[PDB]
Write a protein that binds this DNA or RNA. Structure first.
Ligand SMILES: C#C[C@]1(COP(=O)(O)OP(=O)(O)OP(=O)(O)O)O[C@@H](n2ccc3c(N)nc(Cl)nc32)C[C@@H]1O
Ligand SMILES: [Mg+2]
Ligand SMILES: [Mg+2]
Lengths: 395, 549
DNA sequence: GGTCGGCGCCCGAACAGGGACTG
DNA sequence: GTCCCTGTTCGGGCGCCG
């Protein structure tokens, strides 16, 4: 098969990211997979004259002694849409990375796919390989496998025009309004289709509005917290007014003193309860800008998010509620969170969002791979937030 | 011999050209050994004589070896290195004896003149020109940037058949140093060892018997490995009476290196003595606490200590224990009072922090280091109350976590030193605080008003808006009683104080912490600034006087 | 004395990010 | 924007190994 020439963006050198400590089982699975991938000619050992490196690890999927190798290609991906899919009852995600392995990679570009397997207690220098085929996890892999995949899926689509088949990185999203069961059987028909060449519910995705407390008594303190939350929200909803509630405070009251809600105050508050129901105005998705996702920990396995692009122009605001046990793993919850949110952002826009994680960076990187399950890795950065925004999206 | 292994292709940086540095003044004994080397290497094909078609030169020199009898022929390629292409280093860290499994039979051995047994790339050999008081390298020179990485890559390529056909002999491979373990009887062991020396020879790699250790205690990587214990080779501390920045550095380095088997080492005070300096030579007076820290470390180092080896059958355990001033010591064992290794964590991450954040940071450090050495995570023994941890990761807005652990009553115990109420206190005086400061003059004010009529305004000089905000909080803490409600409009201060710190680089915040520990109920509330909400409004008119508008 | 690479620690310099401020 | 404060990274010195 002929090879497509590929080049980096101008004035960018390839990636030079150090490989981070793997665990014994992750290393052993990586080495098994890698020796068989060398036996099959997909990868070739390389030396230290290649100065490019991208990290590598591996994941275990649920209840199957199969491991999956993950290359962290986002640094390289940097250097290189079916809007009805959000509307299907059932949506299955299929892994189809193996397919890329059947197409060669531009030789000029293989030195950029370079990666190093580590070894326990450094028994051994890093063992380095580069890719001969298209790699699982790279931006260009589906780009090039384009025409091949439109061919492969022509007959299945023509046969089932009410189905949606989206592709992003190593994943294929198949969505249909079929019954559960008929849906699954159609999916098995698609798997049998793919094996001739060689579970989500978007209907039930809800936005979480900002909501105001309902009380019978109001204290100086409750009203200051209300006015603060409204003052902030006015930056999203300009219809928010706080005149009357404010004027009720006027003067140097003790936090615990109770204030009674004047008629104008109670009406301003009910009108502001309304205004927070109308959706946000003037928020259009820009494909040429990055999606940004902020995640707040509200405690009790409660995690709120907003996806936006321009500040205050929230494309979506959501929440993610898990087990409130005494054995809650906050990191585990966070990664599960960011994976769910990345799925939403892909299904809705076909783009991954850059995350603003509430976590010490070291804490994140130590564990976050222990709980990953998806074939892509979204960008992220770490924040040191005030619980102001935290207090605003509370419930 | 010269390995018939293919030479790693090496180029230079675009638009660069070889070194043209000329020899420096050289003692003879060095030149005598230089020529005695150079000529035997020329005999062996390791350096080849060049003429004037080669415009390049680089300084050479020599040093004694660990032997101290022989000589290391070093070249000074600062310029060539600056101009050679970039590599990807393959040495990813140092092996640690505490990640050695118990083997029935062991050998350590070292390779005969190793760099000089591996072929440089021909098209590059020219920039390796030198003149002894004119040759070029046909092998790997010492002092060149690419020689480590290249050697190590290569040595791995070579050993790869042996490891493939002998997957049950473990070969720890640092530079040319090889530790070899097997579960065979000593007889069959030495058989497999001779088989490996034969393999290395086949690739042109001699294992001089002079460095072929057959009996314990195997000297390896700075340790002595006995069959069931290991220990670090003896450590000697600098015992000056006037210390300088460099005397200090080497002292802390010896200490840090010790801390890996000597539990309890402490370096924060000494290290703090290094703050602000300029040159290596600045002599500096030991403070009484640095002096005493040194005393107790010295006291520690006199005792005997040894690690054991790693059993994968047993669990890994890390226990952590607290010293002062954000210092922490941990011990990783598998079986009580049988240290696999020890350590210490002291890093100060944050302007403000508390013992609980530091403990978690320590846990992360140990987890990453355990993964490196043994590939798995230890179970923990930690001096923090299951309740203190539940409360903490309850209220704290950041994701945070600690793998499987258990409490151990080993004072000092870790606790949060105070707590902020969730709801405002009935009967507690309510302080509306604020500060403001002028950007040109650096003049400001900070103060409060209270629902009970009191109001105070303090002037400050050479201050900052944030500083004034903290000053007003501090004031309010100073003048209130054992219960007080505080309302500030400075999410910076709120953000510090909710975090529940107990140490701060800032003195203001330390005074603030002292106050917060003294009280019995504090409630700290926020309101948006400059929005006419009493009595934020009154205090803001109070401090904005003379310093704003 | 004077070279190289890796890792550790520790410090300081140079960044990036975000909140409060002036007329 | 400027100023202020927090965080991260990167490079400098020492240590340790070859
Ligand atoms: C591989 C390897 C070796 C092994 O050491 P060795 O101390 O065993 O020396 P050797 O070459 O093996 O000779 P022998 O063992 O017969 O005495 O490490 C390297 N080495 C060591 C010190 C040293 C330095 N001060 N600067 C530089 Cl840039 N490289 C250095 C090169 C040497 O080849
Ligand atoms: Mg040697
Ligand atoms: Mg203010």
């Amino acid at each position: 098969i002929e090879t497509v020439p590929v080049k980096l963006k101008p004035g960018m050198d390839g990636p030079k990211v150090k490989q981070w400590p793997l665990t014994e089982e992750k290393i052993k699975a990586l080495v098994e997979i890698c020796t068989e991938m060398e036996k099959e000619g997909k990868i070739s050992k390389i030396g230290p004259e290649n100065p490019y490196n991208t990290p590598v690890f591996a994941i275990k999927k649920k209840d199957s002694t199969k491991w999956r190798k993950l290359v962290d290609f986002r640094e390289l991906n940097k250097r290189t849409h079916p809007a009805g899919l959000k509307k299907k009852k059932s949506v299955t995600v299929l892994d189809v990375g193996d397919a890329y392995f059947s197409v060669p990679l531009d030789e000029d570009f293989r030195k950029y796919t370079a990666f190093t397997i580590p070894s326990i207690n450094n028994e051994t220098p890093g063992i380095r390989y580069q890719y001969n085929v298209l790699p699982q996890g790279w931006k260009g892999s589906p780009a090039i496998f384009q025409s091949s995949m439109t061919k492969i899926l022509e007959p299945f689509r023509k046969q089932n025009p009410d189905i949606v088949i989206y592709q992003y990185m190593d994943d294929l999203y198949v969505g249909s309004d079929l019954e559960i069961g008929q849906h699954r059987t159609k999916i098995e028909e698609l798997r049998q289709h793919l094996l001739r060449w060689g579970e989500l519910h978007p209907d039930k995705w809800t936005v979480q509005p900002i909501v105001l407390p309902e009380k019978d008594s109001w204290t100086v303190n409750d009203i200051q917290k209300l006015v603060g939350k409204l003052n902030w929200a006015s930056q999203i909803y300009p219809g928010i007014k706080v005149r009357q509630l404010s004027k009720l405070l006027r003067g140097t009251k003790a936090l615990t003193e109770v204030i009674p809600l004047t008629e104008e105050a109670e009406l301003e508050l009910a009108e502001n309860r309304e205004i927070l129901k109308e959706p946000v105005h003037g928020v259009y998705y820009d494909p040429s800008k990055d999606l940004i996702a902020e995640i707040q920990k509200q405690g009790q396995g409660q995690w709120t998010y907003q996806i936006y692009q321009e500040p205050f122009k929230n494309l979506k605001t959501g929440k993610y509620a898990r087990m409130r046990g005494a054995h809650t793993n906050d990191v585990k919850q966070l990664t599960e969170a960011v994976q769910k949110i990345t799925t939403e952002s892909i299904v809705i826009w076909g783009k991954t969002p850059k995350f603003k994680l509430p976590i010490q960076k070291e804490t994140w990187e130590t564990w976050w791979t222990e709980y990953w399950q998806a074939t892509w890795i979204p960008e992220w950065e770490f924040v040191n937030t005030p619980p102001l925004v935290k207090l605003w999206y509370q419930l | 011999p010269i390995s018939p292994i293919e030479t790693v292709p090496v180029k230079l940086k675009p638009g660069m050209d070889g070194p043209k540095v000329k020899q420096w003044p050289l003692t003879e004994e060095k030149i005598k050994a230089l020529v005695e080397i150079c000529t035997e290497m020329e005999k062996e094909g390791k350096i080849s004589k060049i003429g004037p078609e080669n415009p390049y030169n680089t300084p050479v020199f020599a040093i004694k070896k660990k032997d101290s009898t022989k000589w290391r022929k070093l070249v000074d390629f600062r310029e060539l290195n600056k101009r050679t292409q970039d590599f990807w280093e393959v040495q990813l860290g140092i092996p640690h004896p505490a990640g050695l499994k118990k083997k029935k039979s062991v050998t350590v051995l070292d390779v005969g003149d190793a760099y000089f047994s591996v072929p440089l790339d021909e098209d590059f050999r020219k920039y390796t020109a030198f003149t002894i008081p004119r040759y070029q390298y046909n092998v790997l020179p010492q002092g060149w940037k690419g020689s480590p990485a290249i050697f190590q890559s290569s040595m791995t390529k070579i050993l790869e058949p042996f490891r493939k056909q002998n997957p049950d002999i473990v070969i720890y491979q640092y530079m040319d140093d090889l530790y070899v373990g097997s579960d065979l009887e000593i007889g069959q062991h030495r058989t497999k060892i001779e088989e490996l020396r034969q393999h290395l020879l086949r690739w042109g790699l001699t294992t001089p018997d002079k460095k072929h250790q057959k009996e314990p205690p195997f000297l390896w990587m700075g340790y002595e490995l006995h069959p069931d214990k290991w220990t670090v080779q003896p450590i000697v501390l600098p015992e000056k009476d006037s210390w300088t920045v460099n005397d200090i550095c080497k002292l802390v380095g010896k200490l840090n290196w010790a801390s890996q088997i000597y539990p309890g080492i402490k370096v924060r005070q000494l290290s703090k003595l290094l703050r602000g300096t300029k040159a290596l030579t600045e002599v500096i007076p030991l403070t009484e606490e640095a002096e005493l820290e040194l005393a107790e470390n010295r006291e520690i180092l006199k005792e005997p200590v040894h690690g054991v080896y790693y059993d994968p059958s047993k669990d890994l355990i890390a226990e952590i224990q607290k010293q002062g001033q954000g210092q922490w010591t941990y011990q990783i064992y598998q079986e009580p009072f049988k240290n696999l290794k020890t350590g210490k964590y002291a890093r100060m991450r944050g302007a403000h922090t508390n013992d609980v954040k530091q403990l978690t940071e320590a846990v992360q450090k140990i987890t990453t280091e355990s993964i490196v050495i043994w590939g798995k995570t230890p179970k923990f023994k930690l001096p923090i109350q299951k309740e203190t941890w539940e409360t903490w990761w309850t209220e704290y807005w950041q994701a945070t976590w600690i793998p499987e652990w258990e409490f151990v009553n080993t004072p000092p115990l870790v606790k949060l030193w105070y707590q902020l109420e969730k709801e405002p206190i009935v009967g507690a005086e309510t302080f509306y605080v604020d500060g403001a400061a002028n950007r040109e003059t650096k003049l400001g004010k900070a103060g409060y008003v209270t629902n009970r009529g009191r109001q105070k305004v303090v002037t400050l000089t050479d201050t900052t808006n944030q500083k004034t905000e903290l000053q007003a909080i501090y004031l309010a803490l100073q003048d209130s009683g054992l219960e007080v409600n505080i309302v500030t409009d400075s999410q910076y201060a709120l953000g510090i104080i909710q975090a529940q710190p107990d140490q701060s680089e800032s003195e203001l915040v330390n005074q603030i912490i002292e106050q917060l520990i003294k009280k019995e109920k504090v409630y700290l509330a926020w309101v948006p600034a400059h929005k006419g909400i009493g009595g934020n409004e009154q205090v803001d008119k109070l401090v904005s006087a003379g310093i704003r508008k």
